[PDB]
Structure formats: C-alpha cells, structure tokens
Design a binder for this molecule. Structure first.
Ligand code: HAL
Lengths: 193, 218
C-alpha cells in the first residue's frame, strides 16, 4: 500500500489522502494513540466521530482508496494510515500537518570527528517528517537518531552512527535524508576533517 | 461504543524476565461464533503497528514464540516471555468485534538495565553551514542509563544557555540505553569571535561531568 509521506495543508483547507478487502483509515497524533476513522470495500463504514470530517471513496480504475478530510484544524494534524484487512496490512502512512507555514527543504550538514562516531545534522526543514538512514540502510547497529525539535517554525534533527574506528574513512559512510513534503532527498558522504 | 482500557502507560522489566500487559473491554469481545475479536499490536517509533496476536490468543506469523495472548471475555493479557532489548515499544490491544473499532491506550515496555556512562562527542560547525552564516556546535551523549542527564555549554569559559536545543532518543532497541543530542547555534559572526567551545555531560554514573571541547584555532 503506497501512501504519500506527507501533506502540508493550510488551515481551513481540505485535502484528499490516497492509498475483495476492506481499506481502513486510522488516525494518530505524534506520540499519541490510535483512532479508527472508517473503512471502504473496493458500502462504507464511518466512525460517528469522523462523519463528514472525512469522506471515503475508491477509484477501481486506478485501484486507489481515498479519504478526504475537510476544513482541517490543528486537531487534524496527525499520521493517517490506510490498512487493508483481508493479517491487516498497514500502510506507511501520511503525516498531515495543518499550518500556514510554507514547506522548506532541510539543510544537511555532515559531522566528522576502538570505535569512531560520525554524525549528521538536518537543519531548518518544515514540515515533518524526514526519513534519515546511513548507507541507505546498510548501517543500523551503531545508529542513534534523535527526534526532531521545533524552534521558530523550523524543525532541526540530528543522527549519529558509531563504527569500528579502523573501518572509517576506509569503508565509506553516507547520511541519507528524505523529506517527503519537499520531495527531495539528500545524501552527504562524511569526509575526514 | 466499546471502550478498550489499558490500566498501565508503561511496564518495567529486567531483560530475560517475563512480563504481562493487560487490556479490558466494556463489553464481551466473544462473538456467538466462538471467536474473540481482540488484536495485540506492537509499535516502534516511526513505524506502523505490527501484528502480534489475532483472535485473542493466536500468535501471528513471524512473531517469536516468546509472545502469547490469553483472556476472558473482557480481560486480555499479552505475555512477553524471556524479554529482549528489541522488545521495547508500545503495545496496543484493539477490538474489531463491532464498529466503530477502538484501541486501548497502549503500554510502553521499558527495560531496567545496568547503569552506563555517556560517551560524549563534540562536533564543530560544518564549513557548509558557516558559508550560510550559521554556526551549530553539536554534542552527542550516547548510550547512557538511566535516562535523566544534564548538558552544559561553555564558550571561552562562560556558560551559554541561549541557542541550545536538546533531544532525547527513545529507549535503544539494541542495548537498552538512552542517548541525547545537544546543539548550540550561533551566527558565524559570533562563532568566529570566540575560541573554545565546551559541552559537559553530568550523569548519575559519575560526580564530575564528562567534558569535551575544541578550539576553533587548534
Ligand atoms: O456488526 C458486526 O457484526 C461486526 C462489524 C465489525 C466486523 O465485521 N469486523 C470484522 C471481524 C468480525 C468477523 C465476524 C464477526 C464479527 C466480527 P472485521 O474485523 O473482519 O472487519 C473488517 C475490517 O475492516 N477490519 C479492520 C481491522 C483493523 C482496522 C484498522 C487497523 C487494524 C485492524
């Protein structure tokens, strides 16, 4: 199930999220719980609390389910996942950010110094989220990725990676930063200082 | 509608030990067809919930044998046996007996481990940031325990509190430790007018703080 990574919508605006089974939609505020919105069968079922706020449809042609959220408010900012029930298959989810701020791609700065620690600084982006990895996922063991923090309308995030010192810079390491909202990904190979 | 309750935000457990997560519904989840519509999911930061148990006591495929589910018609329990570091996360129960489907509040699994001192690293601003006029000095205090920790920035000896933003990671799924990142931001103008930059980690594992510093000139 393919779902856009993010949608920045102006407050008061509407937005239509894209995605023999039931396609369900679930809402979740960052760091919060899970709420069931409703579902469709490409008959619909709405959670009474979400009637109207949400409108569920499906395009058999392109085979994609849609949920339209109307006149969004801060309360509406949350991850929305579509999950197919035949083992339900959860989607990657779309993080909807309701704000009047404009989308701003991040600046990605490399951070170089028995083990050695390299880092990656991701500054000034909006809105969330960003998907950071190292060597496109090859490295995970020595990884620490700190939750972004909002400061003056801009998010800032860092990530560190620790590896056997004798293997860097000899065995190259690269920071990868995806920013769905701005549709840009950036790779910064960490070089010795 | 049906209310799912989880009377515990989090639960503590020593690695290797067993533990139980509880959940309750406001009505019997047992359908006349003999089945009991209760799911148990696990969610790790930045990931969608992963299925662990279906129909109250059925181990989902791919999930280690260490997980098991049981219950009455309104009380449900998820047992995690021989707990491991990778088990950290939030567990949710969910009923799908009736529309609207409802989820319990979730219970976060927290590992009680041995104390660990932080490994501190300091990074000067990158040349790319300087060319844009900003100067961020970054310090990583990695793999420590307990979670509580303090950082202190100093410039040429004077403590600097403004332009400092910190961020803690969730409990590490590898070694069950915690980490924190501290960033001091200045303009190049001011960054170029001071020489020594220092961050100081003060954790329970020690009286005197772990300090790291560098000199723009050196
Ligand atoms: O009115 C009724 O009798 C039941 C309505 C709900 C329902 O049909 N749930 C089904 C189970 C069931 C089967 C037989 C008898 C009773 C219940 P169901 O869970 O297959 O419903 C289909 C569906 O869309 N399920 C979504 C489950 C799900 C949604 C979001 C996240 C994770 C899981």
């Amino acid at each position: 199930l393919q779902q856009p990574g993010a949608e920045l919508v102006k407050p008061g605006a509407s937005v239509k999220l894209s995605c023999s089974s039931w396609i369900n939609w679930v809402k979740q505020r960052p760091g919060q719980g899970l709420e069931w919105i409703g579902n469709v069968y490409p008959s619909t079922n709405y959670n009474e609390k979400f009637k109207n706020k949400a409108t569920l449809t499906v395009d058999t042609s392109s085979s994609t389910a849609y949920m339209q959220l109307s006149s969004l408010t801060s309360d509406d900012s949350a991850f929305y996942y579509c999950v197919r029930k035949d083992f339900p298959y959860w989607g990657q989810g779309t993080l909807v950010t309701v704000s009047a701020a404009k989308t701003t791609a991040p600046s990605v700065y490399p951070l170089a110094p028995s083990s050695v620690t390299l880092g990656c600084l991701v500054k000034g982006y909006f809105p969330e989220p960003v998907t950071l990895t190292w060597n496109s996922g090859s490295l995970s063991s020595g990884v620490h990725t700190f939750p972004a923090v909002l400061q003056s309308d801009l998010y800032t995030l860092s990530s560190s990676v620790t590896v056997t010192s004798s293997t860097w810079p000899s065995q190259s390491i690269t920071c990868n930063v995806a920013h769905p909202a701005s549709s840009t990904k950036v790779d910064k190979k960490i070089e010795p200082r | 509608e049906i209310v799912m309750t989880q009377a515990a935000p989090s639960v503590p457990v020593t690695p290797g030990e067993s533990v139980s997560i509880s959940c309750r519904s406001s009505k019997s989840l047992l359908h006349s067809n003999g089945n009991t519509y209760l799911n148990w999911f696990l969610q790790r930061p930045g990931q969608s919930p992963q299925l662990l148990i279906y129909r109250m006591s059925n181990l989902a495929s791919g999930v280690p044998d260490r997980f098991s589910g049981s219950g009455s018609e309104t009380a449900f329990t998820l047992r995690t046996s021989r707990v491991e570091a990778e088990d950290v996360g939030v567990y949710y129960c969910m009923q799908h007996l009736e529309y609207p489907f409802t989820f319990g509040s979730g219970t976060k699994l927290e590992l009680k481990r041995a104390d660990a001192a932080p490994t501190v690293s300091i990074f000067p601003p990158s040349s790319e940031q300087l060319t844009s006029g900003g100067a961020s000095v970054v310090c990583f205090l990695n793999n420590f325990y307990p979670k509580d920790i303090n950082v202190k920035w100093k410039i040429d000896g004077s403590e600097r509190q403004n332009g400092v933003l910190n961020s803690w990671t969730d409990q590490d799924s590898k070694d069950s430790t915690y980490s924190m990142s501290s960033t001091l931001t200045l303009t190049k103008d001011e960054y170029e007018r001071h020489n020594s930059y220092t961050c100081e980690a003060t954790h329970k594992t020690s009286t005197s703080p772990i300090v790291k510093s560098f000199n723009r000139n050196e």
